[PDB]
Amino acid sequence: APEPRVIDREGVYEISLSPTGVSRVCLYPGFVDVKEADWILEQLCQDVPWKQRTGIREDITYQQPRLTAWYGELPYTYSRITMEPNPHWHPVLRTLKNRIEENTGHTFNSLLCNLYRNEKDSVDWHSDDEPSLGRCPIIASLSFGATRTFEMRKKPPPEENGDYTYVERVKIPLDHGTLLIMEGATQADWQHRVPKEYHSREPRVNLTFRTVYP
Ligand SMILES: O=C(O)CCC(=O)C(=O)O
Ligand SMILES: [Cl-]
Ligand SMILES: [Mn+2]
């Protein structure tokens, strides 16, 4: 089994060129300085209306191993009743939205907040390929609190018979205040997850900004 590549330096990485196109990730460690990130984490922990929700795999439901809240536009196929998106952005979240946009040149209209309570909270392998994100969505990820690992694995071609054993893999540590951008063919050609850990972890808040189209 090949060895996962590690991305942990500020930079811009074309992680693949095919089959759909160039998949690109950009890493910005310390996008938010630690002390400001400490204050932001406090605010979001006190104010975001975190709730336990269910997810779907294979038309069966389950309690997601994370708490969530939504702001702005919601992907068309999700349930507004279940996800309860707030069209009025928390002022702190609005600031971070504006700061990402001013520093990267990308716009967003949707925010998913994820609270990983501890080392047993996680998100399983997936792509951000909801239809209303379009082909090649630009997705910005901002992390606060405990470091957790963002893993990626390349979607195998058909001749691989659905085996992920030998696909290319990337590992990215996401620490306090780090911004990560995915763009290009990344949702098309890759999956990603945040795995559970077998060692004590304090809380982590992740902000995933996206653009939902009508
Ligand atoms: O928390 C992370 O960094 C990943 C979150 C994610 O993949 C999602 O919100 O769909
Ligand atoms: Cl999950
Ligand atoms: Mn995702």
Model resolution, angstroms? 2.0
Cβ(1)–Cβ(165) below 8 Å: yes
DSSP per-residue letters across 47-97 = HS--EEEEEEETTEEEEEEEEEEEEE---TTS-HHHH--BSS--HHHHHHH
Q: Which residues pair with 12 in a beta bridge?
A: 26
Q: List the binding residues for substrate.
A: 50, 76-78, 129
Give the method used. Answer: X-ray
Cβ(4)–Cβ(171) below 8 Å: yes
Is the backbone peptide bond immediately before 19 cis, with ω within 30 degrees of 0?
A: yes
Q: Whose CA is nearest to atom 8 of ligand 1?
A: 208
Query: Nearest ligand to the C-alpha of residue 143?
Result: 1
CA of 192 to the centre of ligand 3 (A): 6
CA-based radius of gyration for the chain: 17
Q: Which domains does the chain have, with CATH numbers?
A: 7-210 (2.60.120.590)
